[PDB]
Symmetry: C6
Subunit: 91 residues, 6 copies
């Protein structure tokens, strides 16, 4: 069980993914700075596309609470209705 | 396990979220007034968007039974059909 | 675990909700008449909107078998298709 | 646990419902003829609407294998697509 | 637990159904030729309609790997979208 | 439990499928080169159609991280909305 393998499922909510991410990070053989850099790269690098869109919309300099607050709607009725409406609109 | 971390899932019903909220609140090192203020801030602050819409519609001075009664339809067939209909209508 | 807290989930079928309702009612400190009045008030008062619509359509003087028979379709394919069709029709 | 209480869930497949029906019937205090009559009344009487439609379409003199074969499509993609198409068509 | 009772659920994937089919077949009191004939009759006879369509499309002289390969898409997004599109098209 | 039997479910995410694939591969009686060839044939050969489309789009010379990164969106809201939009568009 390594940190590079923690990938977000297509239907897994973002909070469970980040929970598994830090849980695996606490059990990884690496220094503190390396764990911080992994937090700044792999946590967003290994997300699902539906959340990588919103996380890419927040841009850099976004805190963890802002990311989780911005992605906790993915999956819910409003987000699915909006995504389907945009898909039918553009196609 | 802290109180600031209890966040509502995108598909979790509101009643389970408030149940976990008070369950974690009973096991938090804080005075009574602090627990009341946390109840008045974090419970609505850390909800999912689909319920934050209705809770924002009820406005302040709304009791817990009014919130739970107003949000227990989120997820059900009628709410999903209405949200999808509005999404197709505006887009 | 009190009787006032038994609320129907947005996706829970009506039969499971009434099962939990009577199960909790048998373990509540109240007289027989009080349990009957609770059966006549809270069981319909604390239902989800999708079932409160049909239970409101049956009106008073409706037996338990009539309620459960009228609400056991909520969630199924026909009910979801009809609700979505009405939502698209009115919007 | 009585036989009159075995009701089909809105999303439960017909085979699980009839399995619970006969399982409860084997543990009911009634004679053989009474169990046969219960099989001929309650098994179809206490089904969900989506299956009561097809079972009503088969009419009487239909065997158990014909009922289960006719209702094992309820829930699947084809049945949901057809029901939704008819709902959008009539509304 | 007999072999005639193993029926595919409306939402069960074909691989789980055939797994239960052979698992029950190994524990059935019948000769080898009888088990082969049961494999050639009941495995396709007792499938759900959504898979009986594709298995009927493959025709006879189709191997097990061809059946499972042809039916492993039932349920997935592409198959549901195609079935719904055809349902809306014909209705 | 053989390696030829590990097939991806219609709703199983790709990461769970490849996890079971390597887990079963580590417990298979075969040399290293044979396990590598099995990795280069069966892992893509025995996928579901929704992922075989994207894996066929990546073409050969694609690494495992590229495959998993390209298929982790299958199932999510965006992929389902896009597939449904294309299905309604072509039909
Ligand atoms: O009433 P159901 O037949 O069980 O329909 C559900 C429902 O889909 P729809 O509301 O779009 O019909 C779920 O949607 P949610 O609101 O839970 O999001 C969806 O789950 P996904 O969100 O993952 O799409 C799930 O689909 P799946 O089979 O892929 O789990 C699908 O169930 P059926 O596909 O069995 O209809």
């Amino acid at each position: 069980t390594s940190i590079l393998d923690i990938r977000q499922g297509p239907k897994e909510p973002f909070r469970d993914y980040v929970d598994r991410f830090y849980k695996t990070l606490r059990a990884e053989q690496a220094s503190q700075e390396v764990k911080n850099w992994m937090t700044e790269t792999l946590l967003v690098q290994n997300a699902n596309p539906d959340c990588k869109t919103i996380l890419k919309a927040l841009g850099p300099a976004a805190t963890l609470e802002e990311m989780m607050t911005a992605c906790q709607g993915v999956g819910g009725p409003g987000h699915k209705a909006r995504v389907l409406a945009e898909a039918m609109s553009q196609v």
